């Protein structure tokens, strides 16, 4: 029986590599050239890989995992018993695949037009408007328009999507899709753990929220900002107000200390998307980590195509399951924000390369959060004033607070948003939220967690969640909340391993081999062991903890309390 098991695993692995490699190809061609032809081929490739999944999934279920001795074989087989979408009857499977395809296409090709004929795409057009406009009505036009065109257009597909993905989940042993997704963490206390983590960052977020609200009151007027209420969702410099980095100019703690125009600097000295990824590649190798293969530069799409073809711009990293072909798909824009994204994506590629020799079923991060944290960890060091100056993009207490504020506008502001997304989806999946209350419950959470309000009252027909990539693309979001917490835990440990002393925010792990070694040993484990082990390998302890992030921002927290206190700010939104 045990002999049949290891043989099954071997056959599953060698056959999966081939089928998954072929699927990755068709999926890539569609993402990089949305045509009715590539669509048709992809949907056909869907059925083929589903066929393979059903064949081996059916076999795997015949094994009594409880009686399997080898833990690795036991772990792989248990995982293969989950057919995911392939568990759906043929009819439902094709409908589900088409549903997903249509939602993704609808989102990626949506445009917002003016009365003339000027239509803007999300990236970089609408994104730039949200980041640079300081006119309430212009920001509103883009904010509302995007939701009218992308959000509303997804609503017709969602209820069916929810029904089918939940059905698939039940056919695989779970109670609903949310249950299935949370299982990726293999942590029964997950919901409580995440709740405790969120609560620990509340003091910091609430103080940042009040400070920013005051600055907005200063700029947009008392008639448009309630000093004791939520902040209008279109004023944070980002379409989803998930990161507030772009309004740094409106909230700079010490304006007497001017900061260079980072974007102007990159452009001023000919930085290109390729340069950007080359710098990221250099940081990884400096740590002793792996460089991306030559093939990466030849097959990746680092720029928005200008040959008439429509593509999915939303940045992503791809593993073609042959241990050789890895690629990034990003309509890269030359600015600091995308430089961080490039590192984020390169972090995924590094993970792909580190565990490429493990059985395919175990080729994943310790948990989804780990996969998301890698690139961000390095980017933390890249973002330091001193590091940016070494790249010639930049030229002290007050400077520390200014830097910490810039970092907080990104990292701290994101905490409540990254927490909120799946709190909403989990309740949609378990049936607590019906299509009648999709939007209203989304905004109840936007208010409760982020303290934001819609600048325009929502009406029947609106489906704002659909205006956020991950929703129509069906990509879990809690991984980002986990990532933002643990990436600071990783930064703290790697900095200590690198011999750094003094304030954590001043640490730059560039070219530290000790740091790189901890990340490598952890990444090599892939999904072979419970994530707490990878956590231990990197940090010396096994739990998730907000301590590192709180320690990183401690100076800012103190500055924020003193500043908000002297202005008599009322934290929160009664």
Ligand X SMILES: NCCCC[C@H](N[C@@H](CCc1ccccc1)C(=O)O)C(=O)N1CCC[C@H]1C(=O)O
> What minimum distance in Å lies between the beta carbon of 250 and Cl ion?
21
Q: Is 26 in the site for ligand X (CB under 6 A)?
A: no
> What minimum distance in Å lies between the beta carbon of 218 and ligand X?
28
> What minimum distance in Å lies between the beta carbon of 453 and ligand X?
21
Site string (288-317) toward ligand X, x via CB under 6 A:
--------------------------xxxx
Q: Which does 464 bind (CB under 5 to 8 A by kind): Zn ion, ligand X, Cl ion, none?
A: Cl ion
The span from the CA of 326 to the CA of 350, in Å, is: 9
* Residue 119 three-state SS: strand
Q: Which is nearer to ligand X, 248 or 254 (CB)?
A: 248
Q: Which does 542 bind (CB under 5 to 8 A by kind): Cl ion, ligand X, Zn ion, none?
A: none
Does the annotation place 147 within a ligand binding site? Answer: yes
Out of 158, 181, 244, 480, the only residue in the binding site for ligand X (CB under 6 A) is: 480
Question: Which residues does a chain break follow in the chain (C to N more than 2.5 Å)?
Answer: 395
Does the annotation place 185 within a ligand binding site? Answer: yes
Structure tokens of 212? 């920013």
Q: Which is nearer to Cl ion, 233 or 394 (CB)?
A: 233
- Cβ burial of 62 (10 Å; 0-12, 13-18, 19+) is exposed
Does the annotation place 348 within a ligand binding site? Answer: yes
Does the annotation place 442 within a ligand binding site? Answer: yes
Please choose, out of 214-222, 318-326, 354-362, 470-478, the segment that lies near Cl ion by the rule CB under 5 A.
470-478
> ∠ at Cα 175 (316, 444), nearest 5°?
65
Q: Is 372 in the site for Cl ion (CB under 5 A)?
A: no
> What minimum distance in Å lies between the beta carbon of 198 and Cl ion?
16
Q: Is 29 in the site for ligand X (CB under 6 A)?
A: no
Please choose, out of 56-64, 243-251, 362-370, 516-524, the segment that lies near Cl ion by the rule CB under 5 A.
362-370
Residues 253/564, Cβ–Cβ less than 8 Å: no
Q: Is 337 a catalytic residue?
A: no
Enclosing H/E stretch for 167: helix 158-171
Q: Is 323 in the site for Cl ion (CB under 5 A)?
A: no
How many other CB atoms are found less than 10 A from the CB of residue 378? 30
For the CA atoms of 43, 356, 341, 207, what is the dihedral angle to 10 degrees?
110
Does the annotation place 561 within a ligand binding site? Answer: no
Q: What stretches of 427-487 adopt beta strand conformation (E)?
A: 452-453
* Residue 243 three-state SS: coil
Q: Which residues inside 350-379 make contact with ligand X, applying CB under 6 A?
A: 372
| C-alpha radius of gyration, the chain, whole number | 24
Please choose, out of 190-198, 408-416, 478-486, 490-498, the segment that lies near Cl ion by the rule CB under 5 A.
478-486
Does the annotation place 371 within a ligand binding site? Answer: no
Please choose, from the candidates 245, 230, 212, the residue with its C-alpha nearest in 3D space to the C-alpha of residue 455. Answer: 230
Q: Is 344 in the site for ligand X (CB under 6 A)?
A: yes
The span from the CA of 353 to the CA of 355, in Å, is: 6
> What minimum distance in Å lies between the beta carbon of 468 and ligand X?
7
* Residue 247 three-state SS: helix
The span from the CA of 151 to the CA of 462, in Å, is: 7
Whose tokens are 């490699």? That residue is 21
Beta bridge partners of 316: 329
Please choose, from the candidates 357, 288, 347, the residue with its C-alpha nearest in 3D space to the C-alpha of residue 479. Answer: 347
Q: Is 137 a catalytic residue?
A: no
Q: Interface with Zn ion by CB under 5 A: which residues?
A: 372
| From 217, 219, 387, 470, the catalytic residue | 470
> ∠ at Cα 188 (360, 73), nearest 5°?
30
Q: How far is CA 200 from CA 193, 417, 557, in A?
A: 11, 15, 13
Please choose, from the candidates 451, 456, 446, the residue with its C-alpha nearest in 3D space to the C-alpha of residue 573. Answer: 451
Please choose, out of 302-310, 342-350, 503-511, 545-553, the segment that lies near ligand X by the rule CB under 6 A.
342-350
Out of 68, 341, 393, 401, the only residue in the binding site for ligand X (CB under 6 A) is: 341
Quick one: angle between helices 36-60 and 90-109, nearest 10? Answer: 140
Q: Which does 327 bind (CB under 5 to 8 A by kind): Cl ion, Zn ion, ligand X, none?
A: none
| From 104, 123, 144, 345, the catalytic residue | 345
Going by their DSSP bridges, the two strands 119-121 and 111-113 should be labelled as antiparallel
Q: Is 476 in the site for Cl ion (CB under 5 A)?
A: yes
Please choose, from the candidates 59, 84, 65, the residue with its C-alpha nearest in 3D space to the C-alpha of residue 8. Answer: 59
> What minimum distance in Å lies between the beta carbon of 511 and ligand X?
25
Q: Which is nearer to Zn ion, 372 or 569 (CB)?
A: 372
Site string (37-76) toward Cl ion, x via CB under 5 A:
----------------------------------------
Q: Is 345 in the site for ligand X (CB under 6 A)?
A: yes
Q: Active-site positions?
A: 345, 470
Binding-site residue numbers for chloride are: 147, 185, 442, 446, 479
Residues that bind ligand X (CB under 6 A): 314-317, 341, 344-345, 348, 372, 473, 475, 480
């Amino acid at each position: 029986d045990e002999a049949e098991a290891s043989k099954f695993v071997e056959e599953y692995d060698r056959t999966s590599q081939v089928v998954w490699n072929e699927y990755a190809e068709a999926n890539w061609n569609y993402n990089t050239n949305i045509t009715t032809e590539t669509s048709k081929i992809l949907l056909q490739k869907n059925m083929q890989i589903a066929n393979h999944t059903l064949k081996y999934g059916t076999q795997a279920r015949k094994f009594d995992v409880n009686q399997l001795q080898n833990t690795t074989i036991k772990r792989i087989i248990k995982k293969v018993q989950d057919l995911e979408r392939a568990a759906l009857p043929a009819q439902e499977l094709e409908e589900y695949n088409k549903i997903l395809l249509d939602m993704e296409t609808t989102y990626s090709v949506a445009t917002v037009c003016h009365p003339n004929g000027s239509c803007l795409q999300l990236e970089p057009d609408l994104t730039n408007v949200m980041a640079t406009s300081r006119k309430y009505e212009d920001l509103l036009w883009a904010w509302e328009g995007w939701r009218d065109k992308a959000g509303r257009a997804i609503l017709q597909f969602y209820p069916k999507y929810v029904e089918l993905i939940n059905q698939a989940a039940r056919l695989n042993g779970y109670v609903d899709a949310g249950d299935s997704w949370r299982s990726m963490y293999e942590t029964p206390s997950l919901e409580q753990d995440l709740e405790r983590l969120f609560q620990e960052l509340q003091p910091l977020y609430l103080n940042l929220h009040a400070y920013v609200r005051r600055a907005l009151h200063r700029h947009y007027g008392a008639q448009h900002i309630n000093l004791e209420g939520p902040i209008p969702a279109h004023l944070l410099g980002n379409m989803w107000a998930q990161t507030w980095s772009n309004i740094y100019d409106l909230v700079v703690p010490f304006p007497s200390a001017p900061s260079m125009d980072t974007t102007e600097a990159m452009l001023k000295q000919g930085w290109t998307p390729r340069r950007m990824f080359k710098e990221a590649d250099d940081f990884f190798t400096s740590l002793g980590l792996l460089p991306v293969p030559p093939e990466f530069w030849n097959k990746s799409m680092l720029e928005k195509p200008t040959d008439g073809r429509e593509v999915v711009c939303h940045a992503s990293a791809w593993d073609f399951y042959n241990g050789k072909d890895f690629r990034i798909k990003q309509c890269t824009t030359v600015n600091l924000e995308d430089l961080v994204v490039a590192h984020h994506e390169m972090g995924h590629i590094q993970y792909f390369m580190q565990y490429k020799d493990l059985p395919v079923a175990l080729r994943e991060g310790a948990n989804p959060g780990f996969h998301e944290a890698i690139g961000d960890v390095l980017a933390l060091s890249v973002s330091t004033p001193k590091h940016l100056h070494s790249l010639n993009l930049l030229s002290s207490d007050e400077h520390d607070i200014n830097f910490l504020m810039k970092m907080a506008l990104d990292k701290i502001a994101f905490i409540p948003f990254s927490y909120l997304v799946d709190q909403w989806r989990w309740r949609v999946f378990d049936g607590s939220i019906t299509k009648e209350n999709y939007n209203q419950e989304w905004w109840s959470l936007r208010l409760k967690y982020q303290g934001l309000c819609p600048p325009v009252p929502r009406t029947q027909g609106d489906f704002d969640p659909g205006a956020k990539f991950h929703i129509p693309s069906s990509v879990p979001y809690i991984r980002y909340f986990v990532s933002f917490i643990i990436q600071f835990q990783f930064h703290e440990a790697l900095c200590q391993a690198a011999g750094h002393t003094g304030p954590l925010h001043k640490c730059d792990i560039y070219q530290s081999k000790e740091a790189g070694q901890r990340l490598a040993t952890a990444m090599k484990l892939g999904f072979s062991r419970p994530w707490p082990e990878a956590m231990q390998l990197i940090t010396g302890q096994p739990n998730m903890s907000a301590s590192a992030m709180l320690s990183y921002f401690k100076p800012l927290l103190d500055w924020l309390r003193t500043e908000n206190e002297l202005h008599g700010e009322k934290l929160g939104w009664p």
